[PDB]
Write a protein that binds this ligand. Structure first.
Ligand SMILES: [Mg+2]
Ligand SMILES: [Mg+2]
Ligand SMILES: [Mg+2]
Length: 135
RNA sequence: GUUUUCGGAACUGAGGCCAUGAUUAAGAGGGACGGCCGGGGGCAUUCGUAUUGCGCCGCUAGAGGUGAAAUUCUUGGACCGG
């Protein structure tokens, strides 16, 4: 069920970890990034908008993704981590670290980590007003 | 008798003489000149991601928002990846 690769060699795919403050996306796709293998989110595991971005939902999503990818023959993963970016926050949400550790403990081999978040040169106007959000 | 002379003026042309006649260059100010200097200004040109939208491809059931939610977009493929 996948490529024919010797025991010593590992098949590589990239994993996009979109860690917003509303939920977390774990999205494994090919090295080229065009064909996807498993994409499950934190909202697909917890039925409560509160916990959509919790570390627990990210852990469950990462475990599901790692299991499906192992069933599909990929043993090594390339991690690229993204925050919301744009004019909004640049710090990744709480689910990123939990998802990374979850897919590490799931037997997956770890490639090289990279931080790919949209960093505007000089963006448009941020959503909040001149006085900003007041809550 | 009488036009000169003298006196007075104005208009004057050659001379001699003046120790011939211009204070200083403001820790005032202009204006020059030289090498620079600077997100100063105007015109044109060029690049950078990001945002939004569109086309195609993949897998897709959620995605968004919040203190918690709802309004809102979603198998007439939303969100995510290229
Ligand atoms: Mg002077
Ligand atoms: Mg529902
Ligand atoms: Mg897209």
């Amino acid at each position: 069920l996948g490529p024919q690769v010797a025991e010593g060699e590992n098949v590589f795919g990239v994993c996009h970890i979109f860690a917003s403050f509303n939920d977390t996306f774990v999205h494994v796709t090919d090295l080229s990034g065009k064909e996807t293998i498993c994409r499950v989110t934190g909202g697909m595991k917890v039925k409560a908008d509160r916990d959509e971005s919790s570390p627990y939902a990210a852990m469950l999503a990462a475990q599901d993704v790692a299991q499906r990818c192992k069933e599909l023959g990929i043993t090594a993963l390339h991690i690229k981590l993204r925050a919301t970016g744009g004019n909004r926050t640049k710090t990744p949400g709480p689910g990123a670290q939990s998802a990374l550790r979850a897919l590490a403990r799931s037997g997956m081999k770890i490639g090289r980590i990279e931080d790919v978040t949209p960093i505007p040169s000089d963006s448009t106007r941020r959503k909040g007003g001149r006085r900003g959000r007041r809550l």
